Design a binder for this molecule. Structure first.
Ligand code: TH2
Ligand code: TH2
Lengths: 111, 111
């Protein structure tokens, strides 16, 4: 099943560029590569601003470049502007989800 | 029925702040606010960079600030990294959609 990795996953800051990668993905499929923080139970606030994208290769595998920040203005996956997120408090992490939300587990991160 | 308006729309450049306004929206409904180009008959390629959003007030209205750019690396609404968009040939426009794609008709812009 889908796998996901980020690097560096710890010891980061605002602007620090990391390498997100995934596996078990559906070949040719487009996977959103964004950062988030479960603002609520089951719900996320992510940063479009530095958002990114990855398409799964033949072997459901791919990769791309992200640029994480300590704090960001947050948006829900429905469009809601949740405003400013974290400053080191709650746990942001990198999301890899497609058109149907399908994706691996959220790779927790820390600042 | 739902309504949409930008200002200014014509005579634009790179980094231009526009005034998007909605109407006949569903109150409490979240509308992403993005610069996009019909890269295909139906399809759009958006700038996730300067995105905005607007929560319809009580009578289905609300507004916010958008900052346009002549050209931009684009994304399809499925996560696909489209690649660079326009330079003044194709007709980007400001889209206003909620999580179900619903929303009023994109208004024509130009640099
Ligand atoms: C694409 C998506 C809505 C748009 C989200 C995306 C996660 C990444 C993301 C981060 C943002 O901050 C902008 C919106 C966005 C790009 C979500 C992952 C799944 C979701 O879609 C749905 O819940 C509906 C799809 C379905 O019917 O399964
Ligand atoms: C949310 C959305 C995909 C994510 C899009 C959003 C338009 C605004 C937007 C701009 C970007 O550049 C990032 C993705 C994104 C936030 C689209 C509007 C409708 C679309 O699809 C759906 O969620 C509906 C799923 C379906 O209709 O099958």
């Amino acid at each position: 099943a889908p796998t996901a990795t980020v690097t560096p996953s710890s010891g980061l800051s605002d602007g620090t560029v990391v390498k997100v990668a995934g596996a078990g993905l559906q070949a040719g499929t487009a996977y959103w590569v964004a950062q988030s923080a479960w603002v609520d139970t089951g719900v996320y606030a992510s940063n479009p601003a530095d958002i990114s994208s990855v398409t799964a290769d033949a072997n459901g595998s791919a990769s791309t470049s992200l640029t994480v920040r300590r704090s960001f203005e947050g948006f829900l996956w429905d469009g809601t502007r949740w405003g400013t997120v974290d400053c080191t408090t709650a746990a942001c992490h990198v999301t890899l989800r497609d058109a149907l939300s399908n994706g691996p587990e959220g790779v927790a991160i820390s600042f």
